[model samples]
Target: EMEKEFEQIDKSGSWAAIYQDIRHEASDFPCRVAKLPKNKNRNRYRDVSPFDHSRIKLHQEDNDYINASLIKMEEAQRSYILTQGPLPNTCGHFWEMVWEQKSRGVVMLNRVMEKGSLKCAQYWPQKEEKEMIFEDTNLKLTLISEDIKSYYTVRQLELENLTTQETREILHFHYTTWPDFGVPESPASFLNFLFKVRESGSLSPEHGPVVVHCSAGIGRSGTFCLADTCLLLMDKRKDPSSVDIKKVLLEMRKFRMGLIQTADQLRFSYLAVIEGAKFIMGDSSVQAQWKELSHEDL
Candidate 1:
């Protein structure tokens, strides 16, 4: 059944068009984002808007806001903070949100620099470095440990309030090989990265929403949250009959626009979701069976 959906989308080659149809029907209003006092869109690749209903509201003493959204999957009991990679100017606001929300972890899907473009800000300290102090937000971000994996890097950071002298631990998960507006090389490697994040328990219900970002914070970032939400719902639901991936993605986009950017991205999102569901269903040969489709056009 899942294979049919996969093959149909493949054969039709209209996943992007279909996703666009869905996105076109969505309400992208009441944004007031541009009117917001904070300089949130610095270093943005494009002008993206967050839906007012599900956007994350920051509560600074000055009441300044950041360009970030909170996506909630009620049934899965999961919420994700979706935002663009910070420009140099907004880095302080990025760390401030993480501290205020008490986020347990940050899932970064892109590198600091990519293809001669600055994808994300250098918000954290270097691997062997100790700490970084952001005077803009009056905060200190200290590096506790960094775990280097084959395709990713995991770092433990301690964010402290300079005034209060309070601090909290944060887990930073970086997925290195995902190309912009495209998918990973294999579902297995991506799944392995997802499991590493899950095992950390930082995405658990007890903590604040896990912060997720890519260059635009909508393409790969949206795919990451959607796949994770769909699989979690499948695993937690009493009825394992089906996964309404399309619906889940639509709901997610209500929080942040332009998720799963292209048709290839839409197709890739489904592949990751299907494989993740298989893992939850206890498929021992999950990785080996889920091969990358040989699509020359994609």
Candidate 2:
């Protein structure tokens, strides 16, 4: 049904209608905490606020509010902490969430700067052994290793809880080529990046929910998670056709106010899930094609 609709929807030019319908169904949960005078500056986008119901709460007193939401996809056994790219003052809270949640990885879906404006603060160390200390949260991050690819970079960092003197390795998956306010070039590149995160086993149930953020933590973050979850759902059901993409996205929107920001992103999600279904359905050749299409060698 999903793929069937995919083929016809493009010809009909109804992705706008479908995306609007999904948006209409999304719960208009209140964001009182994120609107407070003290918390206003912590938000990157004035309009994109995290719903109070599912927003992540930091431990420190008077420092709890952060523009982040915990999205749990129980059927797919995947949990993601969807959050905005850190503002200058919120970077510490970002790391604090990672520490408290014990997340094994952070998936960054946008560049630090997009269209000449700041999209995210430089929250990580720029060089190996360089330390970034969030004094308020008492957390420290040291860059351990970096591997750069054409569209994405995989960085391993050592996160230390300064208060506890405990350290853990955190993987940073940064997709560099994804344009802000848009989808990637194609689903193949997107899926190739997704599979890289999969290969590390970061999305498995064994680890804490991975931290996923774009500029607003809704558009590209939602697309990444939607495609990833739907592909896994297909595998779990042993039937690619059984997973309904719209229903899955609506389910995810329950945790955050808006997930996919635009109709194009919604359309791309379908494209990705369709392409990924081939791999899930036992077509092993597509993996190589995806890698080649992504041009990771460059």
Candidate 3:
């Protein structure tokens, strides 16, 4: 009777093992699920740092030591000097920044192709299939089909030419949304894409930094960068560290003021990152079990 009962117990599977695997997959560390409170001053852009601009300017002209110290911090932290360029119909300033260090590549996520004649080819079709174009300083431009369905697009461009004489590589994923605002249903898929990129050892290299940009290099791009950076930092901390959510927004503003331009976008981002992290970790045991089939009778 005991033997029969043991056989029937279905020793082939254990809930604890399943739970552990789920937990491990879901988060880099144990995370408690809690509703993120709405930010009251979501539209506000206030500098929290106490460094006085006028004083700093004065020091720059008169005090070489202070100027030198500031330069070192800028260099150490990988700071980019933001500049404003020509503008007219565009909402924000024409912003540009120089990377202190060279990047391995760049990724662009655009809503749609600009409506106009192609410089190389005249009188092309107004509506052409969206594609990802990879070009390097030395190599020929390679274009690949962008499978993701979004009004906006995310593109990755190689900064340096490929040493190997083989064809260039381009990866594309499609989603249903605009580049300015991503589809809520797509974060899980996007997270998986990012994981694959990291797994491929592309992001692990010292110089192989990924440059993600949407038109204006703000909005959706800012949100994506913030979400990714937050998760990366969270994974590094042994315990939950006190994080100022505004830090990223401020950093982005230094380049493009109003990095996250609207309240709706800001709220959506906060909610999405939290939810995305949860999905990426896959920590729910109940969900995991339901996804698999049981063969107890067999």
Candidate 4:
């Protein structure tokens, strides 16, 4: 069953190349992939706008916040944050300001100026504004009102200047969605990307919760969230119990809005998680053991 699902996902589209590209380049950082949102028919990648400020305001109040310490910001960073809803203004309050604008692609936040003082900027340039000012720094912030309705997700690389303080409070944005239409990469390649993030040690408590978003804050974000959460659960167990697939998903939806929104997306996550576990465990020894035990009447 799992193999058949993997085969279908592999034949989906050109996502294999994209996955490979991310796996290769993102080696130094923690990486996880989520399908972008599709149209109502669930056929292709639909370019959507960010949510309206009103909606963002509504969702912000309902989501739960998770906290973690930043021993070293670099080491704790991960690619995805499973959001219960849109990012709250309370979290954004600390930053200079938040506004909506057009962005070409994924964006990154860095400490380009002072070591501890963090700054925000965009990777892709926009036509509307040349630049914006934040204190002494000129940085660019883009808001995706169209894509805001979709699941928002991103890989977090590092946290700068977290060691000085004993602890710091950070806010996390969560979102979820079904996998978008795209080709799936090999299981081995995906796991390799995940492991690299663990080794990098980029995320820390001081940096705050790794914020994840999609237009709707559900589909793509959900897949990425469940994948990481399950992986961590597996790592915690000496002899991990069989993952209750439905429960794992239910919890994700409960915390975040919804995950794996479409049938295809749901199937993909189910298969991907199994394959991911296999990749992390290496070979079928553990699985074989589970099967043998299942057959025993004890």
Better of 2 and 3 by TM-score: 2
Across residues 1-298, which tens digit of lDDT does each residue of candidate 3 receive? 2222223333643433432332233212111111112311211112211122200111123221110001111211322211111122111111111121233333333333333421111100122343222231223233333333223233332212334644433332222244334334334434444444444433444542443444343455556555555555444542223333345445444333334544445544554455444534445552233223211111
Cα error, residue 23 of model 3, in Å, equals 37
Question: RMSD to native for every prediction?
Answer: 4.1, 1.1, 16.4, 16.2
| Backbone clash numbers for all candidates listed | 1, 0, 18, 48
Q: How far off is residue 129 in model 1, in Å?
A: 3.9
Give the runs in model 4 whose Cα sits over 4 Å from its true position: 1-189, 202-207, 282-298
Quick one: best lDDT, which candidate?
A: 2
Best TM-score goes to which candidate? 2
Give the poorly placed runs of model 1, Cα more than 4 Å off: 36-46, 127-130, 238-240, 284-298
TM-score of 4: 0.41
For model 1, residues 107-198, the per-residue Cα lDDT tens digits are 99998878887777898999546678889889998889987766778999999989899989999999887765457756666777777788
- Tens-digit lDDT track for model 4 on 78-126? 2333222212322222121121111111212111222343222222223
The lDDT values for all models are 0.78, 0.91, 0.32, 0.34
lDDT: the better of candidates 1 and 4: 1
Report lDDT (Cα) of residue 3, candidate 4. Answer: 48
Per TM-score, what order, best first?
A: 2, 1, 3, 4
